[PDB]
Design an enzyme around this catalytic site. Structure first.
Site, PDB file in Angstrom:
ATOM      1  N   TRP A 104      52.129  41.422  28.429  1.00 58.53           N
ATOM      2  CA  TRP A 104      52.221  40.679  29.468  1.00 58.53           C
ATOM      3  C   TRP A 104      52.690  39.253  28.731  1.00 58.53           C
ATOM      4  CZ3 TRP A 104      47.713  43.063  30.183  1.00 58.53           C
ATOM      5  CH2 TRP A 104      47.736  43.952  30.910  1.00 58.53           C
ATOM      6  N   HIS A 124      36.774  45.088  36.423  1.00 56.40           N
ATOM      7  CA  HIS A 124      36.076  46.086  36.848  1.00 56.40           C
ATOM      8  C   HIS A 124      34.844  46.325  37.384  1.00 56.40           C
ATOM      9  CE1 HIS A 124      37.853  50.493  36.345  1.00 56.40           C
ATOM     10  NE2 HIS A 124      36.912  50.922  36.083  1.00 56.40           N
ATOM     11  N   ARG A 172      38.239  42.392  31.398  1.00 54.66           N
ATOM     12  CA  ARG A 172      38.357  43.295  32.650  1.00 54.66           C
ATOM     13  C   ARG A 172      37.328  44.030  32.242  1.00 54.66           C
ATOM     14  NH1 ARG A 172      41.196  49.297  30.461  1.00 54.66           N
ATOM     15  NH2 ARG A 172      41.331  49.916  32.979  1.00 54.66           N
TER      16      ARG A 172
HETATM   17  C1  HEM Z   1      46.814  45.147  40.838  1.00 50.28           C
HETATM   18  C2  HEM Z   1      45.466  45.153  40.047  1.00 50.28           C
HETATM   19  C3  HEM Z   1      45.738  44.989  38.744  1.00 50.28           C
HETATM   20  C4  HEM Z   1      46.004  46.411  38.419  1.00 50.28           C
HETATM   21  C5  HEM Z   1      47.100  47.438  38.973  1.00 50.28           C
HETATM   22  C6  HEM Z   1      45.426  45.976  37.005  1.00 50.28           C
HETATM   23  C7  HEM Z   1      46.436  47.081  36.027  1.00 50.28           C
HETATM   24  C8  HEM Z   1      46.211  46.613  34.683  1.00 50.28           C
HETATM   25  C9  HEM Z   1      46.176  48.048  33.529  1.00 50.28           C
HETATM   26  C10 HEM Z   1      46.643  48.938  34.079  1.00 50.28           C
HETATM   27  C11 HEM Z   1      45.868  47.829  32.422  1.00 50.28           C
HETATM   28  C12 HEM Z   1      45.646  48.377  31.525  1.00 50.28           C
HETATM   29  C13 HEM Z   1      44.231  49.366  30.222  1.00 50.28           C
HETATM   30  C14 HEM Z   1      44.868  49.959  29.465  1.00 50.28           C
HETATM   31  O1  HEM Z   1      46.000  50.298  28.921  1.00 50.28           O
HETATM   32  O2  HEM Z   1      44.194  49.072  28.367  1.00 50.28           O
HETATM   33  C15 HEM Z   1      44.808  46.804  32.993  1.00 50.28           C
HETATM   34  C16 HEM Z   1      44.867  45.622  31.800  1.00 50.28           C
HETATM   35  C17 HEM Z   1      43.513  44.869  31.863  1.00 50.28           C
HETATM   36  N1  HEM Z   1      43.113  44.077  32.801  1.00 50.28           N
HETATM   37 FE1  HEM Z   1      44.574  45.057  34.509  1.00 50.28          FE
HETATM   38  N2  HEM Z   1      44.795  45.226  36.570  1.00 50.28           N
HETATM   39  C18 HEM Z   1      44.743  44.486  38.177  1.00 50.28           C
HETATM   40  C19 HEM Z   1      44.171  43.281  38.210  1.00 50.28           C
HETATM   41  C20 HEM Z   1      43.374  42.812  37.012  1.00 50.28           C
HETATM   42  C21 HEM Z   1      42.803  41.361  37.414  1.00 50.28           C
HETATM   43  C22 HEM Z   1      41.908  40.542  38.441  1.00 50.28           C
HETATM   44  C23 HEM Z   1      41.512  41.315  36.355  1.00 50.28           C
HETATM   45  C24 HEM Z   1      41.317  40.399  35.296  1.00 50.28           C
HETATM   46  C25 HEM Z   1      41.391  38.838  36.423  1.00 50.28           C
HETATM   47  C26 HEM Z   1      42.451  41.883  34.725  1.00 50.28           C
HETATM   48  C27 HEM Z   1      42.072  42.698  34.100  1.00 50.28           C
HETATM   49  C28 HEM Z   1      42.939  43.057  32.640  1.00 50.28           C
HETATM   50  C29 HEM Z   1      42.401  42.576  31.316  1.00 50.28           C
HETATM   51  C30 HEM Z   1      42.436  41.193  30.820  1.00 50.28           C
HETATM   52  C31 HEM Z   1      43.393  43.913  31.349  1.00 50.28           C
HETATM   53  C32 HEM Z   1      43.807  43.972  29.151  1.00 50.28           C
HETATM   54  C33 HEM Z   1      42.694  45.483  28.473  1.00 50.28           C
HETATM   55  C34 HEM Z   1      42.904  45.356  26.496  1.00 50.28           C
HETATM   56  O3  HEM Z   1      43.288  44.525  26.352  1.00 50.28           O
HETATM   57  O4  HEM Z   1      41.997  46.142  26.166  1.00 50.28           O
HETATM   58  N3  HEM Z   1      42.703  42.604  35.766  1.00 50.28           N
HETATM   59  N4  HEM Z   1      44.533  46.623  33.817  1.00 50.28           N
END
Ligand code: HEM
Length: 292
Positions: free
Chosen positions: A189, A50, A46
């Site tokens: 997920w 970001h 992430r």
């Molecule tokens: C429309 C695009 C996306 C939305 C709205 C978005 C939204 C989110 C949200 C709301 C979280 C939770 C953050 C928290 O509560 O810890 C998150 C987690 C995460 N995101 Fe995104 N995301 C998107 C795109 C991406 C993409 C493109 C990647 C990487 C290829 C990604 C990687 C991740 C990962 C791996 C986490 C997990 C973090 C953790 O476990 O600490 N995201 N994202």
């Protein structure tokens, strides 16, 4: 459009970057307890996305190159809360290898985490250069989760990503989870949180989703198995074009890995001009492949 030419860290080659890879991978192994034993893999993936996702194709601002960001409300914003743990993880690595630039380290951290969680190999290029004089705030540049498919398609055009790239990207190996206190969303997920898989696409198509309100009063799609999908994730099966691709990745792990690999590297390299004399991309061996 500003121009950002990759510049190889002085005298460095493959073996130098593989050493940074190895220290990241070994710390990943060592700090196994983080986030209820999910470990740091997911937040590193992430973090890389970001910082890369601040890029704007229109003026080449943001992106991974400059490694210099200002995070909205110093991480006490739902858009970025939780990422500081990732930066804290990489500080000892940076101290051990002071010669690597910040953009190179943030992006290499995401590549290392994907491979060490058994995802696809991701070729990686060095040569991002810090730009301390030019800081990019993430403010308003990353996507909201309470939106629909048109929002998502339009957001990602700013990152020069098409439908396939977008669907491949968001599945993001089904790594990690949403945390209510960070983002206002709660839950994983899929069942295998720190293994890179195509299970995001399977779960999306095969789970029985119910639209619910979480304890932060935000809507999210939930399944009896205990998985969740954000509104933006769910949109990938509400939109007919996205849905076809979701089905494609659900049905072909290798295709998904290969598409993910290409799109992630592209994402990590947006905004950057690689000299014609630049080294070729590096493919790092895993600890496991090295017997380490
Ligand atoms: C429309 C695009 C996306 C939305 C709205 C978005 C939204 C989110 C949200 C709301 C979280 C939770 C953050 C928290 O509560 O810890 C998150 C987690 C995460 N995101 Fe995104 N995301 C998107 C795109 C991406 C993409 C493109 C990647 C990487 C290829 C990604 C990687 C991740 C990962 C791996 C986490 C997990 C973090 C953790 O476990 O600490 N995201 N994202």
């Amino acid at each position: 459009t500003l121009v950002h030419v990759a510049s190889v860290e002085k005298g460095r080659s493959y073996e130098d970057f593989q050493k940074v890879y190895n220290a990241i991978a070994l710390k990943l192994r060592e700090d196994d307890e983080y986030d209820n034993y999910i470990g740091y893999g997911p937040v590193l993936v992430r973090l890389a996305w970001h910082i890369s996702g601040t890029w704007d194709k229109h003026d080449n601002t943001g992106g991974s190159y400059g490694g210099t960001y200002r995070f909205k409300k110093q991480f006490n914003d739902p858009s970025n809360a939780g990422l500081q743990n990732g930066f804290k993880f990489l500080e000892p690595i940076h101290k051990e290898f002071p010669w690597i630039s910040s953009g190179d380290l943030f992006s290499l951290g995401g590549v290392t985490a994907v491979q060490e969680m058994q995802g696809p190999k991701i070729p990686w290029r060095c040569g991002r250069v810090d730009t301390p004089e030019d800081t990019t705030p993430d403010n308003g540049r990353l996507p909201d989760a309470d939106k629909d498919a048109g929002y998502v398609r339009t957001f990602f055009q700013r990152l020069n990503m098409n439908d396939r790239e977008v669907v491949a990207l968001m599945g993001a190996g089904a790594l990690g989870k949403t945390h209510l206190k960070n983002s206002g969303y709660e839950g994983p997920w899929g069942a295998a949180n720190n293994v890179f898989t195509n299970e995001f696409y399977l779960n999306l198509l095969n789970e029985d989703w119910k639209l619910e309100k979480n304890d932060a009063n935000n809507e999210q799609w939930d399944s009896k198995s205990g998985y969740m999908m954000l509104p933006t994730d769910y949109s990938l099966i509400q939109d007919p074009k996205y849905l076809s691709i979701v089905k494609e990745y659900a049905n072909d792990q290798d295709k998904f890995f290969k598409d993910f690999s290409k799109a992630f590297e592209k994402l990590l390299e947006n905004g950057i001009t690689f000299p014609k004399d630049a080294p070729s991309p590096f493919i790092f061996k895993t600890l496991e492949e090295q017997g380490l």
